[PDB]
Structures are given as structure tokens and as C-alpha cells.
Coordinates of C-alpha atoms and ligand atoms in Angstrom, one line a residue:
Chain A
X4 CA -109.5 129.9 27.4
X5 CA -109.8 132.1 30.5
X6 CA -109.5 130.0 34.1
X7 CA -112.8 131.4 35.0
X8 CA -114.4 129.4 31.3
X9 CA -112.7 126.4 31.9
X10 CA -114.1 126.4 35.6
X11 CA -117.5 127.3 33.9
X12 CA -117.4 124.3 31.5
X13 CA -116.5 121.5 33.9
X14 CA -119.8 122.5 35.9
X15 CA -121.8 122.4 33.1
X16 CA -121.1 119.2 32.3
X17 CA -120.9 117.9 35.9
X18 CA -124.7 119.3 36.1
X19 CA -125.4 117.0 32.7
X20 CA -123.8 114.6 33.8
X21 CA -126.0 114.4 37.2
X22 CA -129.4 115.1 34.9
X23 CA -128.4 112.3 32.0
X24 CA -126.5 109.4 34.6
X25 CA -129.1 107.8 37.4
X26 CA -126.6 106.0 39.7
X27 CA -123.6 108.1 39.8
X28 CA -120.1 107.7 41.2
X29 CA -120.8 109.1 44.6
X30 CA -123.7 106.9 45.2
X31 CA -122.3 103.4 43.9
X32 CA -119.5 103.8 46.4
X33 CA -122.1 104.5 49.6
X34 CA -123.6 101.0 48.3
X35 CA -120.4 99.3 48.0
X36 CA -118.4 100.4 51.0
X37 CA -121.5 99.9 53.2
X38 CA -121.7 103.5 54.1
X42 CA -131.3 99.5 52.1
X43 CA -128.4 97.0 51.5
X44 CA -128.4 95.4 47.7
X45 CA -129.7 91.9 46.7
X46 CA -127.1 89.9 45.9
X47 CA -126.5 87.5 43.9
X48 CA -123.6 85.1 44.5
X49 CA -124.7 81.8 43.1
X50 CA -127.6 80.1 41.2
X51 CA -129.8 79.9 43.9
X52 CA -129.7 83.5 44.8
X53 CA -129.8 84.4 40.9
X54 CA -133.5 82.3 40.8
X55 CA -134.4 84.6 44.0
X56 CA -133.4 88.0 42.7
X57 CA -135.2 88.0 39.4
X58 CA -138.8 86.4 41.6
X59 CA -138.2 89.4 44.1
X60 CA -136.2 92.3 42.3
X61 CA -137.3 91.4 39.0
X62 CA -134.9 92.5 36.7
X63 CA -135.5 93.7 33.5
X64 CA -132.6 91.7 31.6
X65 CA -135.2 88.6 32.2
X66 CA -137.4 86.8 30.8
X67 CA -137.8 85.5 27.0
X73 CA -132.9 79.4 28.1
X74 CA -129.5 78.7 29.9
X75 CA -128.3 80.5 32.9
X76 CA -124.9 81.9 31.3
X77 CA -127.2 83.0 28.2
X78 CA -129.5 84.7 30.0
X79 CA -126.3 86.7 31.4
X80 CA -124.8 87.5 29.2
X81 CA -127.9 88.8 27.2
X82 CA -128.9 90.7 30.1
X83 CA -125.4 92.8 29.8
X84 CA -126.4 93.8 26.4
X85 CA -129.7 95.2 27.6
X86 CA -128.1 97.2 30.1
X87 CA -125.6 98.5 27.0
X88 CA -128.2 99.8 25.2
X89 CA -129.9 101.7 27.8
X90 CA -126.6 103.4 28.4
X91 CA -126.1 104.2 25.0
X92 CA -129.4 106.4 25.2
X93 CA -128.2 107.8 28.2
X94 CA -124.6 108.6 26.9
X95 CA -126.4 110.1 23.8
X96 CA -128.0 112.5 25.3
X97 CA -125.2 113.6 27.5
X98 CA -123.4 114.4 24.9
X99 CA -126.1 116.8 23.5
X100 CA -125.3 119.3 26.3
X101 CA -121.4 119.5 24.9
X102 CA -120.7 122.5 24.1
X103 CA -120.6 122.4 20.0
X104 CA -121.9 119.0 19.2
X105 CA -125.3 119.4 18.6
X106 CA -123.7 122.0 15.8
X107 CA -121.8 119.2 14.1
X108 CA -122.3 117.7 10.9
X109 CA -125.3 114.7 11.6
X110 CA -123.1 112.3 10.4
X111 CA -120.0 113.0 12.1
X112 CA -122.7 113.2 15.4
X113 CA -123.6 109.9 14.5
X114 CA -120.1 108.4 13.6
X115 CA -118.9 110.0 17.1
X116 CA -121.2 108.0 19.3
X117 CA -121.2 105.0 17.3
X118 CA -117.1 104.5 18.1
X119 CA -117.4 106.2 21.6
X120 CA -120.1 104.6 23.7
X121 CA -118.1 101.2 23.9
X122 CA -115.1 102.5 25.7
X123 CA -117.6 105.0 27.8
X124 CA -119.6 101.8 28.5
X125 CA -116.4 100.3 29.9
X126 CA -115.6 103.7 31.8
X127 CA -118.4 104.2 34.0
X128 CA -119.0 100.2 34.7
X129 CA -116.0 100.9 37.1
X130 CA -118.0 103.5 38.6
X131 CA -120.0 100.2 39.6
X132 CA -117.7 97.8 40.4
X133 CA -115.3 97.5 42.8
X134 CA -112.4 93.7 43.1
X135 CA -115.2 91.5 44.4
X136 CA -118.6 92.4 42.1
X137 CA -120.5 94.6 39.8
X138 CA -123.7 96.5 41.3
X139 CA -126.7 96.1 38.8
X140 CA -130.3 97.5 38.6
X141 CA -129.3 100.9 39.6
X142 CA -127.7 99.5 42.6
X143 CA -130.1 97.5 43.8
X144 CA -128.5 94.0 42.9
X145 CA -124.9 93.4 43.3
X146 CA -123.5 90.3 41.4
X147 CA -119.8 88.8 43.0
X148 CA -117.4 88.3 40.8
X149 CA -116.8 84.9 41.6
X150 CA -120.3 84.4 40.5
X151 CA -119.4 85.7 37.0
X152 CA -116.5 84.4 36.8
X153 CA -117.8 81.0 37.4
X154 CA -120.1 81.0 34.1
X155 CA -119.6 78.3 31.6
X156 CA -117.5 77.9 28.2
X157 CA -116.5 81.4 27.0
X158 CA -119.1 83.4 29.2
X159 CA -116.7 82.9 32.2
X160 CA -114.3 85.0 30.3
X161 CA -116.1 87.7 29.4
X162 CA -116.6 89.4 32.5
X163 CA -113.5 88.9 34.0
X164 CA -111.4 92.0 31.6
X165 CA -114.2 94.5 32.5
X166 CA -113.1 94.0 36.8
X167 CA -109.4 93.6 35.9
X168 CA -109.8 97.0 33.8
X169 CA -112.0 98.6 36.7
X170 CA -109.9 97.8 39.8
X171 CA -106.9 99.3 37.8
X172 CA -108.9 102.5 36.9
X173 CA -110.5 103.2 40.6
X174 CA -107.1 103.3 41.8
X175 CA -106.8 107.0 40.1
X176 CA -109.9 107.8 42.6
X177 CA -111.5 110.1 40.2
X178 CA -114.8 111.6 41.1
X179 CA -118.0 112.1 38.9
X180 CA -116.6 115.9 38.3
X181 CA -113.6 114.5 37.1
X182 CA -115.7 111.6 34.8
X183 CA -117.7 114.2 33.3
X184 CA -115.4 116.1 31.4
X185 CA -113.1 113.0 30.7
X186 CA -116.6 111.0 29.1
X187 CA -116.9 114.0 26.9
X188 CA -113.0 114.0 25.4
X189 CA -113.6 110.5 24.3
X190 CA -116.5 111.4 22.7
X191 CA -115.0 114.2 21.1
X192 CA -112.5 112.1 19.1
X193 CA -111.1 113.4 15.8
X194 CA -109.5 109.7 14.6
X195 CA -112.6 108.3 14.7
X196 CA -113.0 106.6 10.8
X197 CA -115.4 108.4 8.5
X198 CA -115.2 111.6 10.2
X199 CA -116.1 114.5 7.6
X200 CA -114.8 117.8 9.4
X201 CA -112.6 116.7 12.0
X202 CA -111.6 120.4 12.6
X203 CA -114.3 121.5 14.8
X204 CA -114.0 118.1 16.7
X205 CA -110.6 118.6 17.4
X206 CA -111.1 122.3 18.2
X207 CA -113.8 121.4 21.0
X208 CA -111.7 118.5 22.5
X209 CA -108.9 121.1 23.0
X210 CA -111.4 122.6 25.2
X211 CA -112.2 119.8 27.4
X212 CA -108.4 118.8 27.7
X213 CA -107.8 121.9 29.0
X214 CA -111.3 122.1 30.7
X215 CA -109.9 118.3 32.8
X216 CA -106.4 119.4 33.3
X217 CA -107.4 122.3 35.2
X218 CA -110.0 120.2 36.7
X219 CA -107.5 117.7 37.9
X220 CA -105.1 120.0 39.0
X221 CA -107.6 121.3 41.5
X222 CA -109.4 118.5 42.7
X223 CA -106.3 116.3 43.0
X224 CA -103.1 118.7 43.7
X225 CA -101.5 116.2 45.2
X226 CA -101.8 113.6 42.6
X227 CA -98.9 114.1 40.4
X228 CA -99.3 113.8 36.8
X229 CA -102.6 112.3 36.8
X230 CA -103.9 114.2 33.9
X231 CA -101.2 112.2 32.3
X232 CA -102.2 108.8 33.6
X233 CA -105.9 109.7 32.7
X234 CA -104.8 110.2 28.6
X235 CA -102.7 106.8 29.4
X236 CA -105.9 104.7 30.3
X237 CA -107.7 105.5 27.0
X238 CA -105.0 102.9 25.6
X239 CA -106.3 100.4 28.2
X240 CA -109.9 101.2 26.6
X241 CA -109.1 101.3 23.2
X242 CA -107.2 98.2 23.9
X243 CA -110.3 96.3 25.9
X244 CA -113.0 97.5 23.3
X245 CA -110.9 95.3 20.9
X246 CA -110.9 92.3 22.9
X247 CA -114.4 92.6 23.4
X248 CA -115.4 92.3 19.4
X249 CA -113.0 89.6 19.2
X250 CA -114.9 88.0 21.9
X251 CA -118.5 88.2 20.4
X252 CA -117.5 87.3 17.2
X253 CA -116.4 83.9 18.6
X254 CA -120.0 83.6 20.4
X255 CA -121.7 84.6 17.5
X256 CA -119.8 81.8 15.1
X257 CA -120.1 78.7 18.3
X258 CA -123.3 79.5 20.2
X259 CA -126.5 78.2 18.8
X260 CA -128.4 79.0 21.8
X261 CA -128.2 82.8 21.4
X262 CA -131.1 83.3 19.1
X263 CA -133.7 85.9 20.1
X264 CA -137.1 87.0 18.2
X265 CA -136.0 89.0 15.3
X266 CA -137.4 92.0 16.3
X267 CA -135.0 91.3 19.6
X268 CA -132.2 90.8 17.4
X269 CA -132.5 94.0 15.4
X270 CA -133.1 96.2 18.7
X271 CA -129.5 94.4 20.1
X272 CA -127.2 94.8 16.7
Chain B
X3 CA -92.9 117.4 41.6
X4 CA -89.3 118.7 40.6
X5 CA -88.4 122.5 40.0
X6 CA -88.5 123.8 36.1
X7 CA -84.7 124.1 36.1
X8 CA -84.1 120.5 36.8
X9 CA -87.3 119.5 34.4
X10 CA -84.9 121.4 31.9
X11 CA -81.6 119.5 32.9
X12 CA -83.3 116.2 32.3
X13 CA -84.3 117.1 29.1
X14 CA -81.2 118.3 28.3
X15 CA -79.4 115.4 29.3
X16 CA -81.8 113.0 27.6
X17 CA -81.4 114.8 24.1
X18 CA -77.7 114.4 24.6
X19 CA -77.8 111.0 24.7
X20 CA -80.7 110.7 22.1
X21 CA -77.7 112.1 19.8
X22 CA -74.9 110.1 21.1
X23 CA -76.9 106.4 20.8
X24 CA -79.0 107.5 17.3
X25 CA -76.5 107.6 14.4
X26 CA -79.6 108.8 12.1
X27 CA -81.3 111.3 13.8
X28 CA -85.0 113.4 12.6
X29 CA -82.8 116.3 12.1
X30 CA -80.7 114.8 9.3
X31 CA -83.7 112.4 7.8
X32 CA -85.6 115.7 7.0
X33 CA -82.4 117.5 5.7
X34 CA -81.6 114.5 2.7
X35 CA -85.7 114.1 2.5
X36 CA -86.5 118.3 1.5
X37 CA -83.4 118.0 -0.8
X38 CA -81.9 121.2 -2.3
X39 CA -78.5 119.5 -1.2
X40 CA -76.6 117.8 -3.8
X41 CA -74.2 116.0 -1.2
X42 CA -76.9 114.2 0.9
X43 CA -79.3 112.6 -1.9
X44 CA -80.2 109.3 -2.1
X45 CA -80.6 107.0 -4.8
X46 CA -84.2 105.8 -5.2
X47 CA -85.7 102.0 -5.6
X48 CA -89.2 102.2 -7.1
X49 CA -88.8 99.0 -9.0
X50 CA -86.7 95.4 -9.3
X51 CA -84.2 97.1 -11.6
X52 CA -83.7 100.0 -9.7
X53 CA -83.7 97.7 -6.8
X54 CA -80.6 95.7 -8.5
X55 CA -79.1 98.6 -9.5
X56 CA -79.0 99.9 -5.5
X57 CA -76.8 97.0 -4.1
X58 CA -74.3 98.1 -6.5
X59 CA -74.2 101.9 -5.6
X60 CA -75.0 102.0 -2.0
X61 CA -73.5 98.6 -0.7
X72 CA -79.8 84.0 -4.6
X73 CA -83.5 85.1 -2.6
X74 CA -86.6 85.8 -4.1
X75 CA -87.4 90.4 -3.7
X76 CA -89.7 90.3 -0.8
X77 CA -87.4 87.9 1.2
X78 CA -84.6 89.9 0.6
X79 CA -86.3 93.2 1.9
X80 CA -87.6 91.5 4.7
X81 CA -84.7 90.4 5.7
X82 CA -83.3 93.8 5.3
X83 CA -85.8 95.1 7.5
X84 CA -85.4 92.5 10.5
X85 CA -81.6 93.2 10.1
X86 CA -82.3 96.9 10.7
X87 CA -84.7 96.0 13.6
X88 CA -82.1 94.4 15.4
X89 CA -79.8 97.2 15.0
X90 CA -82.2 99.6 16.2
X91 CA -83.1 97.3 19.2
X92 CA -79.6 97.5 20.1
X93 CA -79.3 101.7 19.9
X94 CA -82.5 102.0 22.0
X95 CA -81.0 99.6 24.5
X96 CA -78.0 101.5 24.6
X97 CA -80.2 104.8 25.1
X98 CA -82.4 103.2 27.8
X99 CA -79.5 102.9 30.3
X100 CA -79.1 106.5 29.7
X101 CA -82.6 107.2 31.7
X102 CA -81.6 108.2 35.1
X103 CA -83.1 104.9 37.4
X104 CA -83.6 102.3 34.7
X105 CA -80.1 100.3 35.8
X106 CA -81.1 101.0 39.0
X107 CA -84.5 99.0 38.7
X108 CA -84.7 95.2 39.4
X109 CA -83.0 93.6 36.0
X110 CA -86.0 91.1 35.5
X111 CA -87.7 94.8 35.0
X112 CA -85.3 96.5 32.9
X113 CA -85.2 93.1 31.0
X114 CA -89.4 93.1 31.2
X115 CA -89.7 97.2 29.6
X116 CA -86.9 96.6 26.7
X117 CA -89.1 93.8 25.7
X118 CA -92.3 95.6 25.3
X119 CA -91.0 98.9 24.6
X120 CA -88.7 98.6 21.8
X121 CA -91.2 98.5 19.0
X122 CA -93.0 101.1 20.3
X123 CA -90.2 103.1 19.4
X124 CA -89.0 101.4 16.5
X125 CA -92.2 102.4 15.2
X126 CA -92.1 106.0 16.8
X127 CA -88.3 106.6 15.0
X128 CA -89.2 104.9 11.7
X129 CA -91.7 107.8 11.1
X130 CA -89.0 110.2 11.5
X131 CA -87.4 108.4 8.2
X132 CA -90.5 108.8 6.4
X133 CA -92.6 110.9 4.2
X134 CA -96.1 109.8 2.5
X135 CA -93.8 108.9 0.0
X136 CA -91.3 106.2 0.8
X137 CA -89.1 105.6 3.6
X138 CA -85.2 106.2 4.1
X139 CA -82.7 103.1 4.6
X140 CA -79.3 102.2 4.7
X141 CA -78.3 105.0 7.3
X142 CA -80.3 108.1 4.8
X143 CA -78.2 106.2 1.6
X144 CA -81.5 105.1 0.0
X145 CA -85.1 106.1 -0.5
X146 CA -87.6 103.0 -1.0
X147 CA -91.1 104.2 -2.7
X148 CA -94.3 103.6 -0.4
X149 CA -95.4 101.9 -3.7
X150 CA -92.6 99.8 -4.5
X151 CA -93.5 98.0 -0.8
X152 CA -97.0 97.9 -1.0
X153 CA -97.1 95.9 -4.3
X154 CA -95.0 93.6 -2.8
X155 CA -96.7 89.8 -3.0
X156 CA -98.2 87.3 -0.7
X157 CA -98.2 88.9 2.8
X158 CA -95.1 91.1 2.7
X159 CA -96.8 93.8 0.6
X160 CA -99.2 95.0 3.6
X161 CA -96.0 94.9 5.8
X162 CA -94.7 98.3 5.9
X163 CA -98.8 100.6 4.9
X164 CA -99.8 100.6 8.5
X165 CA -96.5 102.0 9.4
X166 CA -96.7 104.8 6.9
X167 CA -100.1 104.8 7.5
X168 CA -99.0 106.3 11.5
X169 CA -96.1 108.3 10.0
X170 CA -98.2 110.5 8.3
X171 CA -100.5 111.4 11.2
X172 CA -97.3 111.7 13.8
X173 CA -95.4 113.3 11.4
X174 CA -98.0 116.0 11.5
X175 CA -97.4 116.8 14.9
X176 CA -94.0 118.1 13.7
X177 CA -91.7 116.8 16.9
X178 CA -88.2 117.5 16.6
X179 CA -85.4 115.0 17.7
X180 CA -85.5 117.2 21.8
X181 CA -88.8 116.2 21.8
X182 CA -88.8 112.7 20.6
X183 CA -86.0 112.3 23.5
X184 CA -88.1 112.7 26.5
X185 CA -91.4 110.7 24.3
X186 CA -89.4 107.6 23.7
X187 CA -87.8 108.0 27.2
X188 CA -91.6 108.1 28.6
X189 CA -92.3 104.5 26.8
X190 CA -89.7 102.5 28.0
X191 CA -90.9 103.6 31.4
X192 CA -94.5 102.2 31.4
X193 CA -95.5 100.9 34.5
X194 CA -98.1 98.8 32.7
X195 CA -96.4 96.0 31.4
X196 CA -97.5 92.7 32.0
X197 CA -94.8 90.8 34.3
X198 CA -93.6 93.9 36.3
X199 CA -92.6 92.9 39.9
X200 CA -92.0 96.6 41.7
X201 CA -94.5 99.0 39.5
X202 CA -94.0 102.3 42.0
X203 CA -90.1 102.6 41.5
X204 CA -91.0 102.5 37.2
X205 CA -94.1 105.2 37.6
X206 CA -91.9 107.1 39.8
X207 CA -89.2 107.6 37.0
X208 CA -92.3 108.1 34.4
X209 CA -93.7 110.9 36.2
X210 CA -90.3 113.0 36.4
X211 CA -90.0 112.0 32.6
X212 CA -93.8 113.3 32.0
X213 CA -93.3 116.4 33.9
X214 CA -90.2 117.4 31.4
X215 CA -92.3 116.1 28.6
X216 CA -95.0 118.5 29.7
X217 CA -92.6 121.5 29.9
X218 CA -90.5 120.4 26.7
X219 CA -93.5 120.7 24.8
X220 CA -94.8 123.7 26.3
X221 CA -91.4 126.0 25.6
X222 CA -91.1 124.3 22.2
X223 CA -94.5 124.7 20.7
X224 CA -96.0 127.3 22.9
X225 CA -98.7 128.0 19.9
X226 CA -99.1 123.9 19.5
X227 CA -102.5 123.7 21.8
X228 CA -102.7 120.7 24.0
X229 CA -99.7 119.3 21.9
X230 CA -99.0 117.0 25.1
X231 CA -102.5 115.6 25.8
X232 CA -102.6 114.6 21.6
X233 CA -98.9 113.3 21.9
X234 CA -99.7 110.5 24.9
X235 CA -103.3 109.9 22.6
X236 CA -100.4 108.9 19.9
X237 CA -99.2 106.0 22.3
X238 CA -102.5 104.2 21.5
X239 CA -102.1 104.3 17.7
X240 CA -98.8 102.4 18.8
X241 CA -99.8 99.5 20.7
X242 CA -102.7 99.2 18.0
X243 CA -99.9 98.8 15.4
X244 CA -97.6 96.6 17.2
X245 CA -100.5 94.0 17.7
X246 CA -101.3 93.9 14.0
X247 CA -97.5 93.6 12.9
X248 CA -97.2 90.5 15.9
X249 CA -99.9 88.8 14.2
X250 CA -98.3 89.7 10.5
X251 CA -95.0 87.7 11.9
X252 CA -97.3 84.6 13.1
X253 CA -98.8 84.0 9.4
X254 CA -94.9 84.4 7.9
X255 CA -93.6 81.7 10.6
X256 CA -96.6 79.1 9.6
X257 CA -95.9 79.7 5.9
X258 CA -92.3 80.2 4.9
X259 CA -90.8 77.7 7.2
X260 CA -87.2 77.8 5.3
X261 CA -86.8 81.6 6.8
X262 CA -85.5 82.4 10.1
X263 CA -85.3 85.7 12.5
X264 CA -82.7 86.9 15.0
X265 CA -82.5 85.1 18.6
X266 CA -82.7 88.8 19.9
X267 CA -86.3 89.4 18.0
X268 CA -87.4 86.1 18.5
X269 CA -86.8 86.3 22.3
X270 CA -88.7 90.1 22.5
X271 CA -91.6 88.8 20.7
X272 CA -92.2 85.2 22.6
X273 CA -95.5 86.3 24.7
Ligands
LIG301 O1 -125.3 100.0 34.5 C1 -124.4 100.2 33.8 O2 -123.9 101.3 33.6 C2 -123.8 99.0 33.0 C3 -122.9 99.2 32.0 C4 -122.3 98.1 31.4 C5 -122.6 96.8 31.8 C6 -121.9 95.6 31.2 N1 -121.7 95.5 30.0 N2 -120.9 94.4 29.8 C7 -120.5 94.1 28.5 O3 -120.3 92.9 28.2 C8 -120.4 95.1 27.4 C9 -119.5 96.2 27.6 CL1 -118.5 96.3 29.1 C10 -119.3 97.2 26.7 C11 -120.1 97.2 25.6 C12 -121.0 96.2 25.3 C13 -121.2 95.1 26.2 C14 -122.2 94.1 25.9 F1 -123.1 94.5 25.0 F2 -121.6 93.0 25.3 F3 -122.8 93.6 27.0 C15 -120.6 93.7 31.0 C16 -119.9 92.6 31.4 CL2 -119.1 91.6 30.4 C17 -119.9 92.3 32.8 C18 -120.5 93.1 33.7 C19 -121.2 94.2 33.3 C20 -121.3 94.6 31.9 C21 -123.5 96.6 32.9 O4 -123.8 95.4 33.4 C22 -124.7 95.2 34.4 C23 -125.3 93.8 34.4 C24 -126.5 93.6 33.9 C25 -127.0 92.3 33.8 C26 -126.3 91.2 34.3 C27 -125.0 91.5 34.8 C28 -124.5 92.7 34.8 C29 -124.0 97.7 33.5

């Protein structure tokens, strides 16, 4: 493609992304630095406050760590609606076969999950509630049994991936290649996949090379972190699966369960 | 940033040495694997008798013991070439030894892996320096756990192979592995990113005066490094099952030491 269509696609999607995302980049870091402070929740005590002031959503029908950890799926699905239709507005997915639509978001939104939670997290906690709770890290970590553990990946991940400094223009197109993945198992036509990721390389290379000319090879080191995300979303099953097979208190209403699976 | 003709001396001087360490390089695997030479063919083990029959011609344990073995043995060897290639990299002596000591450890089967599938159609695999073929399906019927030994291997060959690198390309890729600022243990990461950068940037242009019609050939080469530490974990957890179970077999201090941690 032309310079001028490249330039043209990266601000679509930056536009999309804007429209499908409500707390962006830009805005999570004006709440982090310190740039309405957030609630924040550093301890039990503060936890019991938050949810009688704030009232988050992730609450109500159990143990503290549970109710955690449960509340982090919530927010999971909510972002796989959101990532869903983001990807509607790439240029040639809608035009897919259904199933090969379906097959690329079911492998993708895990390691895009993992991608933009850095966008809300910086060494010391995780903003939640479209920014208006922040929960420390120490907090987290500080959960029980395996729960304590489960956390602590996703910040070790994020403070290694903030270091590139990427901005939301820069996300937007790299969110689309991984969604755009041709090795994803059961693909039926991996051609046209393959054809419009070629696209969005080119459309974040160019991208890069503008917005960061000083930053040497970072296209490079972008490609190199989808190993660290391929590498985390594995981990994470692994982790689940031992829940699932030691945690007795994890039972929701049916209905609940089916919603979460 | 370094100028275009010194991207192109690197790469130069890294093929050179590729050639000099490698005794069996892509160039000559494909050459005894397309045939039409009556001086280069090997003779082929597809069975036990044909297997009996190859230690007479190309020169008390039960089959898969004995091919195991074989294939540690090689391992070892190949550990040794890549070692002698690494010093090669202009820097990596340089670096702190606990480094160089730390990137040989995680790299090498990275690259074993990487080289193998230069020895290897969807059909069997070459061995004993290109002297013999060994069928795909003589290893995967192999018993207990040995037979799904080698099928993820092949499994990556044929997808790498695809991308149809030749052995100046594969240089510079294997060059860029060992210099991974991301493993765990590292004690001065700039110094190894620096290196990795240079070695990216002639990657980049290698690839781009090579296989100017190959689209985004770099971008789906560094994707490839994730189907490599994928396949090194699974083969890591292979070895653990063989050490609890055959407790009469033994492997090389040098393999044992690389794959402690
Ligand atoms: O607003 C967002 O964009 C947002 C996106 C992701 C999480 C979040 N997911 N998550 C996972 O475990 C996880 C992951 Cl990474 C990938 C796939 C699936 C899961 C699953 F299902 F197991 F939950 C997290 C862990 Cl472990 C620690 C911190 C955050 C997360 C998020 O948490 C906000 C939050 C809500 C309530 C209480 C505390 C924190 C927000």
C-alpha cells in the first residue's frame, strides 16, 4: 500500500478505537500520574468502603479473595463485548467467513485483555471501574492461597510493556494484528486473514516509525511482546484449571456460571 | 541506527561464520532431500529392519532408547557448533560471562529447533551429517512416550519451512535469539538489546533485498519465535515424564546443566 492508505487506516482505527474503548490510554495515565482523585482501595477496610460508596458492579451475590477474583472475570467479559465490536470496524473482517470471525475472537480477546490492562496499571496498582477505583498491588498481592498469585503476572507483564511507551494510536492498530491471526486452530480460509494482517503490519510500522523516530527498532520489540502474551495467556489457563479442581467456594447460580464460561 | 553498508557487512560476516561453525548447512540438506543426485542419497529407516540394516551401512538397548539416545547425542553436538557460532556475534564475549553463560542456556534450543527444520521435510528428517533419512512415521509409532517426541517438531518445520529462508538468512535469525534481552537472570539487559537491535536492523534489510516480493516476511519471521518457546516448553516437560520413568537412562552433564531451571 500507498503511505497516504496506511496513514488513512491507522486513523480509522484510532477513531474506533476511541468510539469502542471508554477509558483510554491517555486518560488512565492523567489518573495515575496525578495530572476527582480515584477511591482506593489498599486493604480490607477500604475494600468494605468502596463497594458501600462506589458500588462496584463486580459485587454482590462469600470470601473476600473470591469475590476478587470473580469480580476480574466480570470485567473480562465486558471487554470481550467491547473488543468485539472494535474489531467490526477492521477493514475486511465483517467479510470473513462467520466461523473464522468467531474462531478469531474466541483465541484473541485473552492476550488483548492482557494488552490494554497495562493501559491501566502502572508498578504499584491497577485502576478499576473506569478509573474511578484504583486497587494497590500490594493489596492484590496480599490475597490468600492461589489468588495472591494470580494478579501478580498481569503487573509484572504490564510494567515491562509500558516501558515501550506506546500511545492509544499506536494500541489500535497493534489490537487489530492480534486479532487478525492466521495460526489460530480451526481457521477455514486463513488467506484473507493473513492478507489483511499484512496490512496492519505495514499500517503499525509506518505508524511507529512516525510517532517514535527515535525509538530504534521498536516495531521489532512490539512483534517480540506477543511471545510474552502468548506465553502469559498460557499460564493463566494453567492457573484456573487448578482453581477450578481445589476451590469449592467458587460456585455461582447456574445461569451465572454459563454467562462466565 | 547503523548505515545500510555496514547492516550489509554484518550480515555478511555472520553468514561466514554460520558456514564455518555448521558442518551441515540448509543449502546441502535441500540438495540430498530434492534428489536427482546419485552421489548425495541417503539410505532410508522406515522400519526395525531397515533400522538394523542402517548401522551397518552408514556407521544391547531396546529401538526407542537407542534413537533417543541418538538424538541427545546429536543435541550435544549441536549445542557445541552454536556455542562456537555465538562468539562469532560481534559483543557477545564482550558481555558479562554470567550473561553469555545465561543466553547459551536459553537460547540453544531455540535454535536447535530453528536448524532441525532445515533437515526436514513433512516426510522424515535427515541424520548422521545428511547420511540417513528417518521416516516421520517410523518416529511417531514409536512406544510409550518417545513416539510424540519428534511430531511437534515436524509439526513447526513444515510451517517455517514455508517461509523458504536460506542459510544468509537463518544467520542473522539465529544470531537475533541468542541475543534476547528477556531472559530470566540477566544482570546488564541494555548492553544485550543494544547488540539485538544492530542484529534486527540487518535482519530487517537481509530480508528486504532477499525476498523483496515476500510481504512483511520480517514481522511473520519474529511471530515464528513464539511457536519456538511454545515448543521448547512442551519438549522440557516431555524430558521430566522420561527422568521419573526410565530411571536406568542418563543425559549429558552439558544438557542436564542447560535444562536445570
Ligand atoms: O477494565 C479493564 O480493561 C480490565 C481488563 C482486565 C481485568 C483483569 N482481568 N484479570 C484476569 O484475571 C483475566 C485476564 Cl488478565 C485475562 C483474561 C481473563 C481474566 C479473568 F477472567 F480470569 F479474570 C485480572 C487480574 Cl488477575 C488482575 C487485575 C485485573 C484483571 C481488569 O480488572 C479490573 C478489576 C476488576 C475487579 C477487581 C479487580 C480488578 C480490568
Amino acid at each position: 500500500m500507498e503511505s497516504a492508505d496506511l496513514r488513512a487506516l491507522a486513523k480509522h482505527l484510532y477513531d474506533s478505537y476511541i468510539k469502542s474503548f471508554p477509558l483510554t490510554k491517555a486518560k488512565a495515565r492523567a489518573i495515575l500520574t496525578g495530572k476527582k482523585s480515584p477511591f482506593v482501595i489498599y486493604d480490607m477496610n477500604s475494600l468494605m468502603m468502596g463497594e458501600d460508596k462506589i458500588k462496584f458492579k463486580h459485587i454482590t451475590p462469600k470470601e473476600v479473595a473470591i469475590r476478587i477474583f470473580q469480580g476480574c472475570q466480570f470485567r473480562s467479559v465486558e471487554a470481550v463485548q467491547e473488543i468485539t465490536e472494535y474489531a467490526k470496524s477492521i477493514p475486511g473482517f465483517v467479510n470473513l467467513d462467520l466461523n473464522d470471525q468467531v474462531t478469531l475472537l474466541k483465541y484473541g480477546v485473552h492476550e488483548i485483555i492482557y494488552t490494554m490492562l497495562a493501559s491501566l496499571m502502572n508498578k504499584d496498582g491497577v485502576l478499576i471501574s473506569e478509573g474511578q477505583g484504583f486497587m494497590t498491588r500490594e493489596f492484590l498481592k496480599s490475597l490468600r492461597k492461589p489468588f495472591g498469585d494470580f494478579m501478580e503476572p498481569k503487573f509484572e507483564f504490564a510494567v515491562k510493556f509500558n516501558a515501550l511507551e506506546l500511545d492509544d494510536s499506536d494500541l489500535a492498530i497493534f489490537i487489530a494484528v492480534i486479532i487478525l491471526s492466521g495460526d489460530r486452530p480451526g481457521l477455514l480460509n486463513v488467506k484473507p486473514i493473513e492478507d489483511i494482517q499484512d496490512n496492519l503490519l505495514q499500517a503499525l510500522e509506518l505508524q511507529l516509525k512516525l510517532n517514535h523516530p527515535e525509538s530504534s527498532q521498536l516495531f521489532a520489540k512490539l512483534l517480540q511482546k506477543m511471545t510474552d502474551l502468548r506465553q502469559i495467556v498460557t499460564e493463566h489457563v494453567q492457573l484456573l484449571q487448578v482453581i477450578k479442581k481445589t476451590e469449592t467456594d467458587m460456585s455461582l447460580h447456574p445461569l451465572l456460571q454459563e454467562i462466565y464460561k
